[PDB]
Every structure is written in C-alpha cells, then in structure tokens.
Swiss-Prot record:
It is a single-pass type IV membrane protein. It comes from Hepatitis C virus genotype 2a (isolate JFH-1) (HCV). This is RNA-directed RNA polymerase. Residues 215-333 form the RdRp catalytic domain. Activity is up-regulated by PRK2/PKN2-mediated phosphorylation. Binds 2 magnesium ion that constitute a dinuclear catalytic metal center. RNA-dependent RNA polymerase that performs primer-template recognition and RNA synthesis during viral replication. Initiates RNA transcription/replication at a flavin adenine dinucleotide (FAD), resulting in a 5'- FAD cap on viral RNAs. In this way, recognition of viral 5' RNA by host pattern recognition receptors can be bypassed, thereby evading activation of antiviral pathways. Its cofactor is Mg(2+). Mg(2+) 2 binds at D221, D319, D320. Homooligomer. Interacts with non-structural protein 5A. Interacts with host VAPB. Interacts with host PRK2/PKN2. Interacts with host HNRNPA1 and SEPT6; these interactions facilitate the viral replication. Part of the replication complex composed of NS2, NS3, NS4A, NS4B, NS5A and the RNA-directed RNA polymerase embedded in an ER-derived membranous web. It catalyses: RNA(n) + a ribonucleoside 5'-triphosphate = RNA(n+1) + diphosphate. The N-terminus is phosphorylated by host PRK2/PKN2.
Length: 554
C-alpha cells in the first residue's frame, strides 16, 4: 500500500555546524587510546539512512489484533485527561529547544513573552479551525557517537529526526501532554517499561521469571520502527487517545494534529528546500515515545495470541520488548517464536534480528541492557542491570570545543553503578579527572528522559545507595559473560585492562580519603572493591532523605 517516505533529491543538510575531533583529547586520552575509532554520525550519511528506511508497507491485521485493540481502548476509557493551558505548555519547553521560524525561541516561550504567546494562540486556533492542511516539518540527521564496528560496515548512518515548528510543539503539549503522563500506565500497567529504575527493572524481570513454572524468555526489536508505523497505526493511536474522557476542545486539536502532522506531511531540510514526504511516525513529535510504546504493545500482545505464547509477562519500552512466558518445550517454543515473528511482520513490525527463545535470564538483551549476577563476599547472589560498555566508553571520549563528555560519565555512573566497568573504569576516571581539576564539588547535570537533574559528585555514595542499595559497593564475583564483554570492549577501544584500573583506583581512593569529608566517603564507599582489607560499609543517613523517584520516570 503506502511508502514510508518519498524524496525530491534535495539534501538533508546540516543543522548548523558539525564538530571536528581535535588532535588532543585532554579529558579522555588517559581513559582510552583508540580515538580514531570514536565517531559522530552526521548529515553526510543522512542519504544512506534515507534509503534504508524507505520501503513499501503492507499491513494485514487479524482477529487477535482486533481483540487486543478493543481491550486497550476499554482500558483507555478509564483515563480522564485535561488540556494544559497554553502557558503551562509553554513552560514545559526545554531551555534550548530549537527556535521558531517566527522570530522567537525557547527563552521567550518559557518566559511567556507577548510575541510568542500570541503566535502560539494563533497556531492553536488554526488547529481548531483547519483539520486538514498538512503541517510542514524539518528533517535533520541525529548527531550521536559510537565506536566503529567493522562487523557492521564501520559507521552507522545518522538517524532521521523530523519535527514541526516550536509553536506547533507547544500546541502538541496543550492537547496531549497530560495524556502522555497517564495513558501508557493506564493501558499497560506494570508492562510499561519507562517507569522503572534499573534496580526496579531487574526486580520486575526476576519476579516474572520466578513465577513461571518453566520460564522461557525472548526479546524483540523492530527494524527502523518509526518507518514501519502506518498511517492506519497513527489514526488508531488517535482513536486510543479519544477513548479517554477529554474536553471537546482537546478532541478537536488531537484529531487535527493527527491528520495534519502525525499521519504524515511534507519535510523540508534546514535550508528550507522541500525534501520529501512522510507517511510514517515522525521521530520528534510529542507522541513519539507513547505512540511507539502503545502501538508496539498492541502488535506484540496480539502476536503473542497468534503464536500461542502461554502466560506472557511483557516489558515494553518504545519498540523494545521482552516476553517472559511458560515454555512449551524448546521445539514448540521455536515454532511459536516463528509464528510471533511472522505475525509482527504482518502487522508491519518486521524484526531487526530474528528472535530466539532463551532459558537463562542473562542471555536476553532488551532496550540495550541485560540482567546479570554477581556474588557478595557472602556467596549471596545479587542481580543488577548491565550492558555492553562499548558505546558508553565511546561517548566518554567525545570531546570537542562545544561538547564535554563529563555529564556522559556521570550518567553512566548513576545508571550502571553496580557494574564492574562503571566501578573499576568510569568511577576511577571520573574522580581522577575531577580531583586534578579540583572541581569535585562543582555540580554536574544528570540527563534522563528529557529532564536534567543537578548532581554534586560528592553525593554519589548516597545517590547510589538510594538507587541500587549498598550491594552496589560490595559486588565481588562477576559473571563470565560480563568479564569477557568488559575485557573485550577495553581491548577494542585501547583502554587499560582491569588490573591496571585496580592500581589506578587504589591511588584515587587514597587521594579521596586524604581529603576527608565527603570526598573521603566517596573513597571508602565507591572504591572498597580496590583494597585487600575491606571496610565494613553501613547505610548512609543522607540516602534516606533522597527522593530520586522522578529520575527514571516520564
Ligand atoms: Mn528498533
Ligand atoms: Mn530498539
């Protein structure tokens, strides 16, 4: 039926300047050596991406899909959602959000400037009055950093980002922001993945695994998910939104945004030239995350019915899915997963990599992470969330005139504090850098799900205990998979091996302790793994007074 995109031949041009690596990387050339391997995706590869995601979608639904969709609409109907005032929506605009073609930017929006408020007022009226004229969007290449993979062609091409003007983005929040805060939990409950901290995610997956008599689990991820979303998927998303109790003015704007923006529209490059036409999800609209997660859930739950998955417990984040279910024996499990994949392919969610049943929790990777196991000194098994450290380490080494990688370091330290690579490598490097700079007490930003939280490095012990438990400071015996992966990624990036990081951490620890105060607490808690004679760590009173509850929610 419909093509995901069509193209005029105009270039996807850069949105301003694209940074050069410099001949010296002074903050990370003591972390790793192979800086040649660290690269940033740019508009230069945007055309290769465009080719890869342009294809004809043919979508065939069935009675399982219809039954699931009915249950989801009924679940939606329990939600009451309100319009945000124009001013409320204005003040949720991030401080550096891309400015408007109409001579104002995020600063004016956040301060309720007269010019910006009046312009947005007219954008909203036009939404209530015109349910049809397509809204123009800008297309740009995502700039993000990876390590070269020769096994996969060297450098990945940049993702495509598609977004409307700042005035429209404010209007989207007026109509749909409150729905984004309520709909996913309402239709998915515990299956909604973007409500869990790493430790809570682990706990959820362990609980599901344990309650199967004979558990089987698998992961599923869709190839180029946004381009596989059909105009009919998007209209079905509106009908799920419309299932909630909404004032009529919201219903009118929701429909108008769907027909004029969400289902498709023309795309212009940063130079204003017409560039193509979109008939799929625009990654950049307010409903991208919620839409992906709900549509993924509809298709996946229906495909579970198609395939005969027994007693499925799901975890869905965007287009990432884990299903833990009752095994029917490996032979039927293999067939069922093929049925699952075939059904998802009919629903227009074809697989990136073919899914495979697994019977060991460590071997299932979803949303770029997996559960692993370490011991204490106790022999007591402790489970925690980890991931391949390759991309975390590459981003740790991106340094330009415009970009400092230190927030990146801190983010990984916070999210993956129990891991051996954070504890021995990133933590060691982080405190070493900040000590030599004498900036240990200068706050840094932790960035997660579009929010920024101010963090003082010297509070990391309390933050980590609050998020991960004191066990995060005493994991002893890591798993074979995890040791292999971490050693391999350090070799791949030219970083010192773990034994060298141990020697460095002994020195960092001694320096931290010698400074007394909070710094000494960092040394004793975060680097207890480094010394032969372990100190007995006790609960930190400050951790009880931390409300980190919004850090890993939307
Ligand atoms: Mn995907
Ligand atoms: Mn994915």
């Amino acid at each position: 039926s419909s093509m995901s995109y069509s193209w005029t031949g105009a270039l996807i041009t850069p949105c301003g300047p694209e940074e050069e690596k410099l001949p010296i990387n002074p903050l990370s050339n003591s972390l790793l050596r192979y800086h040649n391997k660290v690269y940033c995706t740019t508009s230069k590869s945007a055309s290769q991406r465009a080719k890869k995601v342009t294809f004809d979608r043919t979508q065939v639904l069935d009675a399982h899909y219809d039954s699931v969709l009915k249950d989801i609409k009924l679940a939606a109907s329990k939600v009451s959602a309100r319009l945000l005032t124009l001013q409320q929506a204005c003040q949720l605009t991030p401080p550096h959000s891309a400015r408007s073609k109409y001579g104002f930017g995020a600063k004016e929006v956040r301060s309720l400037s007269g010019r910006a408020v009046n312009h947005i007022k007219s954008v909203w009226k036009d939404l209530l009055e015109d349910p049809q004229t397509p809204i123009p969007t800008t297309i740009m290449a995502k700039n993000e950093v990876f390590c070269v993979d020769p096994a996969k062609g060297g450098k990945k091409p940049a993702r495509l980002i598609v977004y409307p003007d700042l005035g429209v983005r404010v209007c989207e929040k007026m109509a749909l922001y409150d729905i984004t805060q309520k709909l996913p939990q309402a239709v998915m409950g515990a299956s909604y993945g973007f409500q869990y901290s790493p430790a809570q995610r682990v706990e959820y997956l362990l609980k599901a695994w344990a309650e199967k008599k004979d558990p089987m689990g698998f992961s599923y991820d869709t190839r180029h998910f946004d381009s596989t979303v059909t105009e009919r998927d998007i209209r079905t998303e509106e009908s799920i939104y419309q299932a909630c109790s909404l004032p009529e003015e919201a219903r009118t704007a929701i429909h108008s945004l769907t027909e004029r923006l969400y289902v498709g529209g023309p795309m212009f490059n940063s130079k204003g030239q017409t560039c193509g036409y979109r008939r799929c999800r625009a990654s950049g609209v307010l409903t991208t995350s919620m839409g992906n997660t709900i549509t993924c859930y509809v298709k996946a739950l229906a495909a579970c019915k198609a395939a005969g998955i027994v007693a499925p417990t799901m975890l869905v984040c965007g287009d990432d899915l884990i299903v833990i279910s009752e095994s029917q024996g490996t032979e039927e499990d293999e067939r069922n997963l093929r049925a699952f994949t075939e059904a998802m392919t009919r629903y227009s969610a074809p697989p990136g990599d073919p899914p495979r049943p697994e019977y060991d929790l460590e071997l299932i990777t979803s949303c770029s992470s997996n559960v692993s196991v370490a011991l204490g000194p106790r022999g007591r098994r402790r489970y925690y969330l980890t991931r391949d450290p390759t991309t975390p380490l590459a981003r740790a080494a991106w340094e330009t005139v415009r970009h400092s990688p230190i927030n990146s370091w801190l983010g990984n330290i916070i999210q993956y504090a129990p891991t051996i690579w954070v504890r021995m490598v990133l933590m060691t490097h982080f405190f070493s850098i900040l000590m030599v700079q004498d900036t240990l007490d200068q706050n840094l930003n932790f960035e997660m799900y579009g929010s920024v939280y101010s963090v003082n490095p010297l509070d990391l012990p309390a933050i980590i205990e609050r998020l991960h438990g004191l066990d995060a400071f005493s994991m002893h015996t890591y798993s074979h998979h995890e040791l292999t992966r971490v050693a391999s990624a350090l070799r791949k990036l030219g970083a010192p091996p773990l034994r060298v990081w141990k020697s460095r951490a002994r020195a960092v620890r001694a320096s931290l302790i010698s400074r007394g105060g909070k710094a000494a607490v960092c040394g004793r808690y975060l680097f207890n793994w480094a010394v032969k004679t372990k100190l007995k760590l006790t609960p930190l009173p400050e951790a009880r007074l931390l409300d980190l509850s919004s850090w890993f929610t939307v």
